[PDB]
Structure formats: structure tokens, C-alpha cells
């Protein structure tokens, strides 16, 4: 549950931050869902982080 | 396997307290960072 929540939170964070709140042309990269590369690593890291905290705290 | 605390009067109250704490914190943070200006 928390891993999926973290992955979704990371993806939504990147989307809202860089494609909705402040739209900033950087290097001509797309401002749409076609910018899905360069968005994966933050999603993965957030999912792993929240999953690990959930595992440890839930065990305790 | 049941949780260690299963069958306790205090379980619902503690869960409630944690949720209320969380909501209060969230609203206050939201206000300071979004609406206080």
C-alpha cells in the first residue's frame, strides 16, 4: 500500500511541479505526458522509500 | 496472526488520536505555506 502510494505521490509531485504549476521550457523537452522519461527515477525512489519505512514501522 | 494489541479498548482511541494529530498538522502546514502570505 505505502509503496504504491509513494510511487504515485512522486509521479504526481513531478507532474504538478514542472508541467502544471510553473511550466518552464528547459532544453525543448516536452511539457506533456510524453515527458515520462526523466520522471521514472523520482517515482521509483519515493516508492522504495515509503515502502521501506512502512515495512520497518509496521514490523515494530 | 492477530496483532499484539488486538482486543484492546485503547486501539480505536489511539488510532483516532493519531489521525486527529495528523489532520491538525496538515491543516496548519497547509495554511502557513499556502494561505498565510
Amino acid at each position: 500500500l505505502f509503496g504504491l502510494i509513494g510511487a504515485a505521490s512522486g509521479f504526481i509531485l513531478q507532474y504538478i511541479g514542472n508541467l502544471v504549476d510553473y511550466p518552464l521550457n528547459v532544453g525543448g523537452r516536452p511539457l506533456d505526458i510524453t515527458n515520462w522519461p526523466a520522471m521514472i527515477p523520482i517515482t521509483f525512489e519515493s516508492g522504495i522509500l515509503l515502502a521501506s519505512f512502512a515495512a520497518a514501522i509496521g514490523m515494530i | 496472526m492477530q496483532p499484539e494489541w488486538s482486543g484492546d479498548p485503547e486501539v480505536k482511541p489511539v488510532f483516532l488520536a493519531v489521525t486527529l494529530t495528523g489532520m491538525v498538522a496538515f491543516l496548519l502546514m497547509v495554511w502557513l505555506f499556502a494561505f498565510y502570505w
Partner: protein, 74 residues
């Protein structure tokens, strides 16, 4: 490396694009390089767009421009 392009005037009169048509024949085997991009960019079709052209034939390497930039941009 293709940093500076030099061509004769008589050939230039017959074809202005001869210098650009050449080089690409040595490098890719074709007159025009078919560069392909995975990144969209921005249209810029109806807005002011700022660009600079520097003429190699005109430049004498005086270095006046370098001093002018230092005074203007601190």
C-alpha cells in the same frame, strides 16, 4: 573538424550552397545531413525571435567586441 568553412568566390557565384553541399558528401555520403531529434522544442512562429549572424569574411580579429561586452555587462 568542421568549425571554419572556407570556399572560393568563383565556385560561390555558380552555387552559394556549394560549401555546405560539400563536407556532408565526405562525412555522410549525401549532400544534406538528415539530422533527427527526439525533442519537440517550441514553435516561436508568431512571436519576436532574437538571433545573431556573424560574418567570417568581415571579421579582422580586432577584439573591440570583447572590450565592449566587458564594459556593458560588468
Amino acid at each position: 573538424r568542421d568549425i571554419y568553412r572556407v570556399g572560393e568566390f568563383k565556385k560561390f557565384k555558380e552555387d552559394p550552397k556549394y560549401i555546405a553541399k560539400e563536407v556532408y558528401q565526405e562525412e555522410y555520403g549525401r549532400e544534406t545531413p538528415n539530422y533527427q531529434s527526439l525533442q519537440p522544442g517550441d514553435d516561436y512562429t508568431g512571436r519576436n525571435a532574437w538571433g545573431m549572424t556573424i560574418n567570417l569574411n568581415a571579421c579582422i580579429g580586432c577584439n573591440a567586441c570583447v572590450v565592449a561586452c566587458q564594459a556593458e555587462n560588468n
